[PDB]
Amino acid sequence: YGPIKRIHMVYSKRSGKPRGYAFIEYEHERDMHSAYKHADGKKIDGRRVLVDVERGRTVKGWR
Amino acid sequence: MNAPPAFESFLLFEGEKKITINKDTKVPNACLFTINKEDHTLGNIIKSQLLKDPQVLFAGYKVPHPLEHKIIIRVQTTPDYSPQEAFTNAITDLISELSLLEERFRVAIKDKQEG
Amino acid sequence: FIKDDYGPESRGFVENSYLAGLTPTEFFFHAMGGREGLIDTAVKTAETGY
Amino acid sequence: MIIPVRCFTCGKIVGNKWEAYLGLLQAEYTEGDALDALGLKRYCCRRMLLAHVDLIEKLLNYAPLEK
Amino acid sequence: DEITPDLWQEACWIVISSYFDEKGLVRQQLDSFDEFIQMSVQRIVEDAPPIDLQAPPRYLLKFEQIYLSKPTHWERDGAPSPMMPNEARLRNLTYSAPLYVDITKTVIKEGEEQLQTQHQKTFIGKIPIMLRSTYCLLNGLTDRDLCELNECPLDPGGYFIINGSEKVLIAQEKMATNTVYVFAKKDSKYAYTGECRSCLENSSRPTSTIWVSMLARGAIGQRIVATLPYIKQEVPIIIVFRALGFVSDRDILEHIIYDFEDPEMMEMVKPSLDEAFVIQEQNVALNFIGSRGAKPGVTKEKRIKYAKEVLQKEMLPHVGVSDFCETKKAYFLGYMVHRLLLAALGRRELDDRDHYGNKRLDLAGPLLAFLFRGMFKNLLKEVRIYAQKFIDRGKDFNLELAIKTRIISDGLKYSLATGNWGDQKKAHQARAGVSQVLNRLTFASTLSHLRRLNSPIGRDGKLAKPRQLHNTLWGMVCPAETPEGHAVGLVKNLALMAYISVGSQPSPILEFLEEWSMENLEEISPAAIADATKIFVNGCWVGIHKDPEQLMNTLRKLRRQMDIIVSEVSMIRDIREREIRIYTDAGRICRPLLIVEKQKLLLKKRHIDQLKEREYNNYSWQDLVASGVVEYIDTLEEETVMLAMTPDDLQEKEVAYCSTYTHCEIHPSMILGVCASIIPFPDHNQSPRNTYQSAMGKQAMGVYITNFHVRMDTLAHVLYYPQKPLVTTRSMEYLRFRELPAGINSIVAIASYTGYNQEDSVIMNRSAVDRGFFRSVFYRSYKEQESKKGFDQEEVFEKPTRETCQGMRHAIYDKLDDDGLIAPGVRVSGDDVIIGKTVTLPRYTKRDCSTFLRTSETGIVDQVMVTLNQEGYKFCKIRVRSVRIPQIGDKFASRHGQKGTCGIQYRQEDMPFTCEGITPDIIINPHAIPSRMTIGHLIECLQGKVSANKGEIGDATPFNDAVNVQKISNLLSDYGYHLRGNEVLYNGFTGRKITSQIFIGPTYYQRLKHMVDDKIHSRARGPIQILNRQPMEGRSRDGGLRFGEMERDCQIAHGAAQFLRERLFEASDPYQVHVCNLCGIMAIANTRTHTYECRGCRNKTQISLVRMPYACKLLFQELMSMSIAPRMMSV
Amino acid sequence: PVPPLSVRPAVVMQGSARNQDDLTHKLADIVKINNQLRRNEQNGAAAHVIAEDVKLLQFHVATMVDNELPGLPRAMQKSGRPLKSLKQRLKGKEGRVRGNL
Amino acid sequence: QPMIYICGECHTENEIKSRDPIRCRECGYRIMYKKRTKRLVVFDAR
RNA sequence: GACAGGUAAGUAUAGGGAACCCACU
Ligand SMILES: [Zn+2]
Ligand SMILES: [Zn+2]
Ligand SMILES: [Zn+2]
């Protein structure tokens, strides 16, 4: 969907196991918006995955 | 696509004579035995036995074509003797050879087994 | 080879038999000869056809 | 791709020898020693073992068309 | 510290191992493409002049920088997708990445009001991406990653994928640009001709070729005249100089000659002065040139302006194009004239056109750069037109709408698909051949194809001179590998260690020279030239020097230290002349060589050990190059290099031959190429047999790629039981023949047996064939797609039924499924529908367009794949596999130019046998060897027996003194065998010993793709061509054989008139016509009503039936179209 | 003269769009020029444009007979692929005479 | 009628109908393969 | 209304071309 400036895979603090969700930072905001609609529902390694803009620091009152 | 079936080598096709006899008009007491679905094994053993036979002025075999599985055996005997009789006696003697060799081999195998 | 060398080896004389094998220079020169032959064939074919 | 079942020339079974040959090789036997241990006297069978290239592992490196 | 010879063998081979680990085999392709993408695209974009328009409002529209994404693919929803290279192969996509640029449009209308706006990442097209290149998505992927992606790790890449077809760019030879070559052409009106194909670093303008000829003797003397670009006449050289602004003959001779003490030169040039005397003024000369111009301008002013433009821009562009470059241009022209004079007087040898050092190899880099330059010019022109047309009405425009990415994208796709290197409309004018379909028959074939070279001379040429192998090709090109057909000698291959420079900027070199004592050309005076040493950089004479020896020492030190001069750069000092030429051009071939100082290699045991431990310490070939033990050398530098086979030459001798060596071969065997390398003991064969093997290897069947199981390649062959040869050259370790062998080691007896192997035929063991000997599988991929081009007419896959669809053959469609597709694991015969397809008509409303299995073919459906093509249409590929058991007529070949067809197969009991049960897998007539000189074949058989008995792999590296026939024979005897390999064999039929003792042993054989089943063909009244009713062509169409002209002539000689008549008339295209007896023209014959009429004569009774060939009827009709009356007098 | 369809056969395509012969296309061009000139004659037109139409018609007919006259431009079917004149059909090897008779 | 195809990427079975655009319902991957036929198949071991 | 079972009536079980390239004898 666009070049990725940085990729972050979250891990368990104590167990170290993979959390199962990551944050991807694209070079351009448009590449992200282009991915918002298409990425949702993708299948990676046989398991369906969902994709939505991270609202943790965008949507007011999100937790 | 044109490869002949393997069994064709030894399986007589429907209505095939296993053996056919002709008289070689060139010289007397001479017969040609055309044997189908046979090869150098039988040809050579029979030729050797007939050559051993003294009355046989002529005995031999050939394969007209390797791609074909037919052999021709030419046998000429003395006037007082028949190529057919010579052929039959040669086969009989080879059969006796095989029987004797079989029983002797059985004895030897047994004896080796005991020690 | 040194410059201005007109010796057999320098100018491409194969002093070794096929069984003995060929030193690299001799092998190269023999390849040149074979190439000459092949080219002659590939051209004479058309010339003679015409 | 896989070790042939029979020696092409003589027909001696060799298909049941590839794993043992590899085991000996990793056991540090020379190739000739391994062949002798397996009993491959005729150089036809010795060829069958020496020249073989087991491509089947490289083939298996790929995932199957079906899960 | 040193390396004793015993150690030296292993040391050199370790060095080669490290080299190949570092570089790979298609390094030249990958590097050329990477350099292209990285530098050349941006260079072209910047060089492109900004477009300004006037309706008043004026626009700038300047391009700034390029940004290239990775290969991406969009569906209908707009979702970009990562096209697996495998995905592109499967779906017939094109592996290309979108390209982008930054554009700045500034508008000025009045009051210098700047409207500078910038549009960033403007999409402008797509660029196909060479696989495994830097920018390919497979770059730097681990072998595990490639296996996951279904990509053979051993696959070298170096090719593009256009619509799912693999394409490879063949390097194209050409005369090196920016050089002075003097050729003697007595055939022409010129005794000699200097020539320079000047060409700036990067320029849409093609190379400007300038000639300077000396007229053949016979008014009084001989005159020198130059032919310039855009001028249809030669010009006196003195006139050219005066136009450049040099009237003083003293100055002109200072520029041309450098030692005025040479009355020879000076007298020889006098006649040119005599010819060109009246014109004494630069303006007069410029007017003269303008008049000589193609379209001289009536005005003398405009003539002079045109001439000045031509001189400044079109003449010696690489020297300069800007004003004030007149001094440099004059000096270079004088140097060219000086070269011509030297050649004319014989003081300097003529340059050899075929001398390979005078050639350059346009790899994928330069070729794509040229194509992209043209295409970018077209895009800029189109944008200019669009913007101009909109601004003409005062209204503005959108640069985004102006841009037509299709220009670039479609042009690149078309060029790389059709190989026609040029504009699509100029197909004929372009040169085809480039961008061939990658040959995937085997790994060896693929490698050779990727390393292929082509000479653009043209196959029609009958001149053996260019075709001949040349001395310069040593170590640069494989001397053996070359097509034996009409293209012999024209198509080549790279030697293993060969490598092609990608080029580099000479700016750092020029800066270093300026820092150095080098003196600028303009700065110096003419006098100093005579004794000084000229310095050229890519043909640009920059200046002179006074201590060339130490200067060259400094340059070599710098290159070895890798400080300012990259390895690719070449430096040559023509000591006999006074020139030092430095080349950083791309396309200059080059090979590594071990450096020698005094009489000792710079390589050392410590280097060897570090290389041995390369895995851990990470020491590498690059580290060797940096340390400066090894050095790259091109052909021009080779001309001066003095080189040694091996350290043995360095070893002191009673009569030192050279004692002044400078380099040493890494190993002589490296001079061979990919295909030639697999040959064991090539140095024991007649060279033409090595040449033949170079191609038969390409044909051998094996495992062409590890991941074949997924690739739906159009045609493929896979051997059941490949085997690495028992006898191996060390070089195949890097060809990876071990990983992907193509052939089987087979016990071969070189004996006469039943005569069925005579004349290059071979008997084969039927029992071995049954046991799987040389059994193979042949995969054929069919493809189809359902097109919805029009609502009126559309195609669909389905299982059609006779009641609905009409165009059905009698073939059964039951094998198909409800989707009009056959399923895997289904037996299939020829002319058997496999893809039931139908089309909606404008037995009703449906016409059959199904795809049947190729006639006479058979097999089982390996697998089926269904996708959507670029336009969403359903698109199905079916791979069908047929098991080919070797049989009579199938082609086999050793590695020694010995090929033959299987004459007959004898079961094991029939085959002859040793005292042991061993029987030969193959028997080959001894009559091959005598004339063929394939002694390498026999040696291979012997050493193969030795190695098989010993439990090792024989080493048949060509130039290996440690191995010889006597040693091999002694070893063989040690294993209880006859020392020469002979054996006592028994006739299989009778058991009797054979009076002779048969040579027998293992030998690597390989089964070539050409099988009798794919060539057998016959016809009896099949389909016929439409234009003429003669039999169709080609067995795929059930065609008929061509009874050609020489066959006609042979029958004529036989006198078989009736047979000739049958062959040419009654069996080809019998026809009947009616002819007016009066005018002798075909007449209208309604046979139903028996109404025969000739309009011209208006008669009806005097008409005669005439039997003639339909081709003859067509010829007569065509003549009458040409308005000829081939009247037909039956009387 | 106008050769019949058999001489310049049109092939029914996999798509419904029939594909016309090279001679057919050349004849179409000639007919177009002929009709244009006939119109420019039946209605008064500048002698210059009449001459230009005559020149173009001459070129088209000459190319139809032979599409290889040196100097002249080559008749170009589409996408820059030259036509095949009758002279080329009959010219040499692979022609009607040597290739088919 | 069912027409089960195996997706290339996820190797998942899925029905496909005629005129249905080819795309794995599971992963949106556009490459599929027909499943091995059920017809009786035999091979003499020659 | 839906859905599961049975009876009756009707339907369904003619062929390309060119160009180019590669390879072959
Ligand atoms: Zn064996
Ligand atoms: Zn008439
Ligand atoms: Zn899927």
mmCIF file of N, CA and C in Angstrom, chain E residues 218 249 258 260 305 384 430 469 473 764 775 868 961 1029 1069:
data_model
loop_
_atom_site.group_PDB
_atom_site.id
_atom_site.type_symbol
_atom_site.label_atom_id
_atom_site.label_comp_id
_atom_site.label_asym_id
_atom_site.label_seq_id
_atom_site.Cartn_x
_atom_site.Cartn_y
_atom_site.Cartn_z
ATOM 1 N N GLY E 218 46.239 9.979 -56.961
ATOM 2 C CA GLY E 218 45.757 10.061 -58.326
ATOM 3 C C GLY E 218 44.326 10.555 -58.417
ATOM 4 N N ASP E 249 48.643 29.219 -40.760
ATOM 5 C CA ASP E 249 49.085 27.860 -41.031
ATOM 6 C C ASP E 249 50.075 27.395 -39.979
ATOM 7 N N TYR E 258 53.219 18.071 -34.070
ATOM 8 C CA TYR E 258 53.785 18.564 -32.827
ATOM 9 C C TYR E 258 55.290 18.740 -32.888
ATOM 10 N N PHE E 260 57.799 20.019 -35.525
ATOM 11 C CA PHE E 260 57.981 20.622 -36.838
ATOM 12 C C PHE E 260 59.249 20.187 -37.496
ATOM 13 N N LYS E 305 26.036 31.007 -39.355
ATOM 14 C CA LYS E 305 25.442 30.630 -38.078
ATOM 15 C C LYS E 305 25.203 29.129 -38.017
ATOM 16 N N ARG E 384 3.978 18.785 -23.593
ATOM 17 C CA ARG E 384 4.104 20.106 -24.191
ATOM 18 C C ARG E 384 2.920 20.402 -25.095
ATOM 19 N N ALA E 430 14.040 -0.495 -36.353
ATOM 20 C CA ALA E 430 14.693 -0.945 -35.137
ATOM 21 C C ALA E 430 15.405 -2.273 -35.375
ATOM 22 N N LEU E 469 37.283 -16.420 -34.474
ATOM 23 C CA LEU E 469 37.710 -16.237 -33.094
ATOM 24 C C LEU E 469 38.917 -15.310 -33.104
ATOM 25 N N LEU E 473 39.841 -12.201 -27.499
ATOM 26 C CA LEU E 473 38.794 -12.897 -26.765
ATOM 27 C C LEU E 473 39.333 -13.810 -25.679
ATOM 28 N N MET E 764 20.865 -49.499 -26.664
ATOM 29 C CA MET E 764 20.496 -49.173 -25.296
ATOM 30 C C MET E 764 19.950 -50.409 -24.606
ATOM 31 N N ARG E 775 14.558 -42.242 -18.186
ATOM 32 C CA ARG E 775 13.151 -41.888 -18.267
ATOM 33 C C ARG E 775 12.978 -40.420 -17.910
ATOM 34 N N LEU E 868 -7.475 -14.306 -12.866
ATOM 35 C CA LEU E 868 -7.980 -13.235 -13.703
ATOM 36 C C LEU E 868 -6.803 -12.516 -14.339
ATOM 37 N N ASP E 961 48.095 -30.865 -14.818
ATOM 38 C CA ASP E 961 49.208 -31.782 -15.031
ATOM 39 C C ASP E 961 49.187 -32.938 -14.044
ATOM 40 N N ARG E 1029 -4.613 -23.377 -52.105
ATOM 41 C CA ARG E 1029 -5.198 -24.599 -51.578
ATOM 42 C C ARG E 1029 -4.165 -25.679 -51.299
ATOM 43 N N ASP E 1069 -2.470 -29.555 -55.177
ATOM 44 C CA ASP E 1069 -3.600 -28.650 -55.323
ATOM 45 C C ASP E 1069 -4.206 -28.759 -56.715
#
